[PDB]
Design a protein around this ligand. Structure first.
Ligand SMILES: *Cc1c(COP(=O)(O)O)cnc(C)c1O
Ligand SMILES: *Cc1c(COP(=O)(O)O)cnc(C)c1O
Lengths: 404, 404
């Protein structure tokens, strides 16, 4: 009598961490070093937490050993409140803010309390794979709207309107975008709002990279651009403040809310179930959002994030058969590859073949629900030396690669 | 502006250790009233401090734990858990069979999500820890409650279990030592539960998070070694025993023949990587807690505060007219029975609410633990004695002239 996985997991595929790592983990155990450009994890690439965060966590640790409120510490939620109040989200109270074990937990919770069987969620393609998985896990269906590579990976508005059904409950916006690195203009975001307003949709805004911007890139939160709509905004400390392991994220409810009291009680229900998010690291939030922002040094010209993005950009375009749109934010690149030139029918196989030959780990584009096997994603976190070595390996790999 | 209700999967979910009565208490606290909250097993506000050996290990390892770790958790942490259960006769367990989550709560939910399809039944004790019922319902499963026998030291009634087994039953939940009854099950009882699970091919889910909080000559028996031929999942953590609930550190261990449940395990691993990882810094405390000297021994012995508080609370609650209670041999709770007809109790939530409004003390009604009748409630034994009598002498005055 076999015990298979539940039906709610039949479509689920969040695997940036998938069966390719099985061979990667094997190579590592054998002693071979594998350059992992697959995960946006700051610490393995030499990114340390700001001292101020570490100091305040250590200081409050003996006082944070018990359960806190399910929504999180008041002072932390107060800091989050003030942060968004300085962006035009004035009516946000501490009761509109939920702190969880990273944004990941809250994304799932937000969908669990919302979706029923048959319900549809508009999700970008390419996506952040958790969003698709979360919707599916919540018994909803992820309907993918296309992002337009020829338009700097901006969402296709005509595609979004065309894929709206009477079952669409909301639309997911990931801005700045993982994995394209796109930074959406205010004009486009205003178009999304109009669509959401006309079709009675809830806007979910994953803005976890809103402070990782390059050059003249300017982040616009969609929440204060939709003051008359109920919107939910996600952000955290993982990427911007390089403390992914502390698991600290939050979601903020903005807009009219009395028509959504039922949904809110569902969220408060899911938060109460697990009692609370981890407490000691919540004391870091106030220090992170307040005072000096250390991320400014990394994204400015000369900063390692800026230079690594530039270096990966130069090398990936100097490869025959590969092009890419330059990221204006976040930590990723989503290069297009001439699938016909290399006879690529399975982009996962290409990733696997590249791993086995050059010991470098990428993520195939279809893992981000891109309909075609002509893309992949690289992370710009590694040192310039590592990026140069891995991309030259990739160039050598592709020069003699004809997928069988 | 159509109404946004909570999802259908949350319609039959409660977990009311935290809710409307709790909501009232906080209002009272805002309003200038000091309230003695005995609703939750939270050690820290009752003068319980983190084992300083745990603190110094987390502090020292904090700068090295900023990034994502393996989804199942830190290797050294899982190493300790493996060895801990190795010593208790589960000699086949490896690191791959261990999942570290943000407290046991997260793992309980995940374990149900990956297992249960719509209509699938899970045997859950009555009374239960309400998260179990919530997690089953949340996963679209049905929580089928088997009664525990108050006249038999709150032991599960084996006849009631067998009478409620249907072809839809997937597994059975065992909370041992028990929340809320504080019962410590015998090896002979646990052995018969194994026999039941063996005949009907049921997965055993063992919540053994109080396995080290024992009184008198009470001996804990893990059901996993007693069922070496069955798949069993055991839950435990640092929250209660090691008084660091706020750190949110728990683990679940898979034991037995796992080949026939490959799909279910793949589901667990999927849910496991969906959130990337559990909070990493506090995972360095597992090795410290599980090894060397156990500080919990000072609290449980006849000199310890937990032993004493358990005593004085049991004797005080029994002397109250119309109230009786079975003495707990473990955990941190009591589940007193009240003579409903004497006070005309038809709703136990209103009773707890009245006691809160009358005397600023917060309890939890028994129906919050899925007990079918309004003739029970729960007391936590964490407060040191001074507040135990205060609140119980308070509870005595309340009942002396109460009529619902
Ligand atoms: C990295 C990432 C997350 C994960 O956030 P956590 O706070 O670490 O859980 C969520 N969404 C996006 C788009 C991400 O890139
Ligand atoms: C307190 C408790 C939990 C929750 O444990 P955490 O690790 O803090 O999430 C789970 N099960 C039982 C029986 C409990 O008493």
């Amino acid at each position: 009598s076999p015990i298979e996985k539940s039906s709610k997991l039949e479509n689920v595929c969040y695997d940036i961490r998938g069966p390719v790592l099985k061979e990667a983990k094997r190579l590592e155990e054998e002693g071979n070093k594998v350059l992992k450009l697959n995960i946006g994890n700051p610490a393995p690439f030499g990114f340390d937490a700001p001292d101020e965060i570490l100091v305040d966590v250590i200081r409050n640790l003996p006082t944070a050993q018990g359960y806190c409120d399910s929504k999180g510490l008041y002072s932390a939620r107060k800091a989050i409140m003030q942060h968004y109040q300085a962006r035009g989200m004035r009516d946000v109270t501490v009761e509109d803010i939920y702190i969880g074990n990273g944004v990941s937990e809250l994304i799932v919770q937000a969908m669990q309390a919302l979706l029923n069987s048959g319900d549809e969620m508009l999700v970008p393609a390419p996506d952040y794979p958790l969003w698709t998985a979360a919707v599916s896990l919540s018994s909803g269906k992820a309907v993918h709207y296309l992002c337009d590579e020829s338009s700097d990976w901006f969402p296709d508005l005509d595609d979004i309107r065309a894929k709206i059904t009477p079952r669409t409950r909301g639309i997911v916006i990931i801005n700045p975008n993982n994995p394209t690195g796109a930074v959406y203009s205010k004009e486009l975001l205003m178009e999304i709002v109009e669509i959401a307003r006309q079709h009675n949709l809830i806007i979910f805004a994953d803005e976890i990279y809103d402070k990782i911007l390059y050059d003249d890139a300017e982040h616009h939160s969609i929440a204060p651009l939709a003051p008359d709509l109920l919107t939910i905004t996600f952000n955290g400390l993982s990427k911007t403040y390089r403390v992914a392991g502390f698991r600290q994220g939050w979601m903020v409810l903005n807009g009219p809310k009395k028509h959504a009291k039922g949904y809110i009680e569902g969220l408060e229900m899911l938060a109460s179930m697990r009692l609370c998010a981890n407490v000691p690291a919540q004391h870091a939030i106030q220090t992170a959002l307040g005072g000096y922002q250390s991320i400014s040094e990394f994204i400015t010209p000369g900063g390692r994030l800026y230079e690594q993005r530039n270096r990966a950009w130069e090398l990936i375009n100097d490869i025959p058969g590969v092009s890419c749109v330059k990221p204006r934010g976040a930590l990723y690149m989503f290069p297009k590859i001439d699938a016909k030139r290399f006879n690529i029918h399975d982009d996962q196989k290409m990733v696997l073949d590249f791993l086995l030959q050059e010991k470098v780990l990428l993520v195939q584009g279809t893992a981000f629900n891109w309909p075609w096997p002509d893309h992949f994603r690289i992370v710009t976190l590694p040192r310039v030396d590592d990026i140069e070595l891995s991309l030259s390996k990739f160039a050598r790999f592709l020069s003699g690669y004809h997928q069988l």
